[PDB]
Amino acid sequence: SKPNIVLIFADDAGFGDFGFQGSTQLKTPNLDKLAQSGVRFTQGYVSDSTSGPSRAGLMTGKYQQRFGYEEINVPGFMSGNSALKGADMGLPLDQKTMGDYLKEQGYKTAVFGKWHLGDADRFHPLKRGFDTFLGFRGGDRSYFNYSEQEMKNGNKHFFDKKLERDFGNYEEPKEYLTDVLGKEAAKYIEQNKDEPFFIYLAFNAVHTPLESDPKDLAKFPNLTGKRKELAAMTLGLDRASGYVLDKLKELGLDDNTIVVFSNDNGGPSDKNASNNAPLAGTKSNQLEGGIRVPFLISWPKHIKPGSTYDYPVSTLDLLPTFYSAAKGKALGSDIDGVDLLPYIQGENTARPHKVMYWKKENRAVIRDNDWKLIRYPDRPAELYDLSSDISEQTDLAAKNPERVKTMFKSLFEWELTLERPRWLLKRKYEKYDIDRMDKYRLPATQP
Amino acid sequence: SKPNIVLIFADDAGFGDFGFQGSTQLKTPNLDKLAQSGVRFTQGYVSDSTSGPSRAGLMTGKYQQRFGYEEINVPGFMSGNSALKGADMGLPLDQKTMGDYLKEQGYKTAVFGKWHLGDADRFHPLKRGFDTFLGFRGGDRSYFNYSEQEMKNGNKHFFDKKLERDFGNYEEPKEYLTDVLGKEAAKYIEQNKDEPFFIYLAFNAVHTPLESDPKDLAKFPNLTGKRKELAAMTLGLDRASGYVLDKLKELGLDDNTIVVFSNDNGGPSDKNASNNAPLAGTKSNQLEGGIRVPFLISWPKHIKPGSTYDYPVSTLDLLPTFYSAAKGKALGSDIDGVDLLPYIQGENTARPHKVMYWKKENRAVIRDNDWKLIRYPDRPAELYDLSSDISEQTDLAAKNPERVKTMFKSLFEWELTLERPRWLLKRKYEKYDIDRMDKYRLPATQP
Ligand SMILES: O=S(=O)(O)O[C@@H]1[C@H](O[C@H]2O[C@@H]3CO[C@@H]([C@H]3O[C@@H]3O[C@H](CO)[C@H](OS(=O)(=O)O)[C@H](O[C@H]4O[C@@H]5CO[C@@H]([C@H]5O)[C@H]4OS(=O)(=O)O)[C@H]3O)[C@H]2OS(=O)(=O)O)[C@@H](O)[C@H](O)O[C@@H]1CO
Ligand SMILES: O=S(=O)(O)O[C@@H]1[C@H](O[C@H]2O[C@@H]3CO[C@@H]([C@H]3O[C@@H]3O[C@H](CO)[C@H](OS(=O)(=O)O)[C@H](O[C@H]4O[C@@H]5CO[C@@H]([C@H]5O)[C@H]4OS(=O)(=O)O)[C@H]3O)[C@H]2OS(=O)(=O)O)[C@@H](O)[C@H](O)O[C@@H]1CO
Ligand SMILES: [Ca+2]
Ligand SMILES: [Ca+2]
Ligand SMILES: [Cl-]
Ligand SMILES: [Cl-]
């Protein structure tokens, strides 16, 4: 029987900022129970440390740099020299999505919340294998309704923040957006309970702006400023996820539903007070704190409850995992991900990925087993043993010069399989990305 | 009195491949006498190790990466994702050229031979401060006439190879192109002998294809294959330069004429059998063999004959040097070059450039005094003391880790002042550039 698939994909959450990730300060009871119901990945990665490229990898099961989706698509932030600007930046139309693949297997498909895979009509979710959409095309938006005046006074890219149903039916949220998105996903489950369905629940929680339900803020009297907002926004993310998980149980769909929880990129600790403990770094850098994310898979009667899987896995793996579960027999020859199920169930004791890569311009990483080489524009390449140094504080480059040379050559061989980028950020953002990395160069710790 | 200015700019010549550069195999009598007539620079550099970007720096007196002219403009070789392709790649129109500056000082201005600063009409020499043109818009062409049929049946970029007078008056060369270009420059001197003139004589010699006057091939009976052609093509370059130098002497203009000889980039030893002795590397890499070039300045009664100048200088310096000689008092505030005359004459004993930079994508160089840091995509950054190690064979990076870190930060600070590139080569050419560098990693030696 073809299982339902629910992918809950948070935005800008701290690695440490869930109960199941070791938080005692924040409250995530619903997602903690999801963790206990299935397998928790201790080394789950996104394909990039920023939103657009991460989502391009997730949606395609491919290294997004292979189709030139290398730097983040941010209308108004792009170089005057960029090949594509504004609404023309998007997931190339020749790429086949997770939605397209599950549509081939007869699934009902919906996306709720953040898209960020292009603002033009041709890049719209309903053109990319999704039946149904309630969300926003761009990278961020308010958790409450925009006034008519705010929409009138927005710059030429502001339209991508407007809450939208399907193909251009604009209507602002009537309550806290996190609750709207969760309730919509639960309504869609109810409407499609008799047929295989795929939901992509792309919460904007816990992305800026720092806005919360006042009742949620009240539950954190001992937290201050940004961290109090993050706590409240996290409680909202967890409650809204709860609407979906509870609806599945209520309708008896638990045994025949795959639920995934992950996060688009590492926490931007300076922006939303996210905490990536015990990792160094943040959003937009390639330290573990930027690329390693909370990662759960639940499939009752198929995946052992309360289990952990400790070899590296990728958001790139989700497309082939979902497609195989959906009884798909025509996977494209170009997929970088692997079906995780044989690995999760111990049929395959090998690493799903011996070698993994990250790249934004001159900043790149090659990982070989637990060896991690990090290349930078502004400092010598660093080598970490992640099996003894999760926080990347002990540079072993000088002690292992032959391994550094061999990993450098392997990194460049992979770079040679990539397209040149399709769009380029203004020069100044490389300084912002590196300066924040140096601000969070030390390990984060649970408060 | 405003001096005449003649800039002879060869293409793809080997560093060692002139008598005045230490060759005992090749014949360059005319240019050897030019060297003896003036100052020879032992550390003269182009702004890039390839044609288009080198010429953009030369024409502007600016780091060409500041206006996004970073990778070479080669129609048909560009990424399908490139922002600008074919005829649209060119020196940005908001840049002010060497021609424009000397036109302001009342000079007659001419360019003969290779342009390579854009194929579209708007990038044409007669739009960029040149009165007159006989040459070709693109990067290479035959040293003999193309048939009407060859020109009709060429790909969509082939038109940029056609020999052109002024604004689209096409006529193929009636003899060996090197002789045509020299004789045209000599005719222009004759026509303008009573008025200040500037000639940019951009020979395609000694660029591929390997075609020579049979009478020149006859002067090298003991050489074979590519090296014989290079020898013959070099003798032609020297004779054609001779037409110009002999015309200046014949008309008594020697004492009031600045003559410069240089070369667009290091020798592509695999392509035209050029020899960069005693340097390592070649065209398209940032070893000394790619970026250091033969560099002569003659101004009889102003520059001491038979002298050498040993501090680093740049083609970027030629615009301000020329403009100051032309009595210009309104240099732009954006010029990276300096007027060399005070340095040559000992009015300024300081280094003209304490710091110099090169950049193509991930490949970059910072030089601080005689320290050279080289960054690569596929290997650890290398550090050379050029005052003890001209051939870049003793990597000091491990011995001097703090200097490596300091120069890395300074390199990135300069990168932050640049635009993103305006066009991007196909990915595969980075493999070709690096593999050839490794083929010529050892010092070249005089045959
Ligand atoms: O006048 S404005 O007050 O500032 O009006 C406000 C709203 O506009 C703003 O909206 C947010 C906040 O500031 C600007 C915009 O932020 C930018 O949003 C981008 C969305 O794509 C992007 O965020 S991201 O998607 O999460 O990556 C930008 O962040 C990136 O910038 C670089 C590229 O990658 C990283 C950086 O290197 C990434 O940084 S990060 O990792 O830290 O996130 C982010 O800066 C502003 O938008 S604007 O269009 O520029 O004006 C306006 O819409 C609203 O109506 O009013 C408010 C004021 O009340
Ligand atoms: O069958 S052919 O021999 O190909 O036909 C010939 C003519 O077409 C060719 O002409 C030459 C030979 O092959 C192509 C062309 O070479 C390319 O010319 C470019 C000019 O811009 C460029 O040279 S460059 O300007 O000096 O840089 C290309 O070299 C570069 O390529 C990459 C970019 O930088 C470097 C590389 O990474 C640089 O390499 S290098 O440093 O070694 O110089 C060079 O490959 C081909 O032209 S075509 O546009 O591809 O078709 C044809 O017109 C004529 O009619 O027939 C001849 C054969 O008789
Ligand atoms: Ca995000
Ligand atoms: Ca050249
Ligand atoms: Cl984001
Ligand atoms: Cl060239």
Author numbering:
A (entry chain B), B (entry chain A): 27 to 473
Pull verbatim passages from the article behind this deposition.
The polysaccharides in red algae (Rhodophyta) are primarily mixed galactan agars such as agarose and carrageenan. Carrageenans are high molecular weight polymers having a linear backbone of repeating D-galactopyranose units (G) linked together by alternating α-1,3 and β-1,4 linkages. Furthermore, transcriptomics revealed upregulation of the CarPUL during growth on ι-carrageenan, while biochemical analysis of eight CarPUL-encoded enzymes revealed carrageenan-specific activity, thus associating the CarPUL with the ability of these pseudoalteromonads to liberate energy from carrageenan. Detailed analysis of the enzyme activities encoded by the CarPUL, combined with interpretation of growth phenotypes, have allowed us to propose a refined and detailed model of κ- and ι-carrageenan processing by some Pseudoalteromonas species.
The potential sulfatase activity of recombinant S1_19B was screened against κ-neocarrabiose (κ-NC2), κ-NC4, ι-neocarrabiose (ι-NC2) and ι-NC4 by thin layer chromatography (TLC), revealing activity on κ-NC2 and κ-NC4; however, S1_19B did not appear to have any activity on ι-NC2 or ι-NC4. Though S1_19B was inactive on ι-NC4, the structure of this enzyme in complex with ι-NC4 revealed the ability of the enzyme to bind this oligosaccharide, and accommodation of the 2-sulfate on the non-reducing end residue in the −1 subsite. However, the presence of this sulfate group appears to cause a shift in the placement of the oligosaccharide in the active site, resulting in the disengagement of the 4-sulfate on the residue in the 0 subsite from the catalytic machinery and formation of an inactive complex. Additional interactions between ι-NC4 and the enzyme suggest the possibility of +1 and +2 subsites. Overall, the data support assignment of S1_19B as an exo-G4S κ-carrageenan sulfatase that is specific for the non-reducing end of κ-carrageenan oligosaccharides.
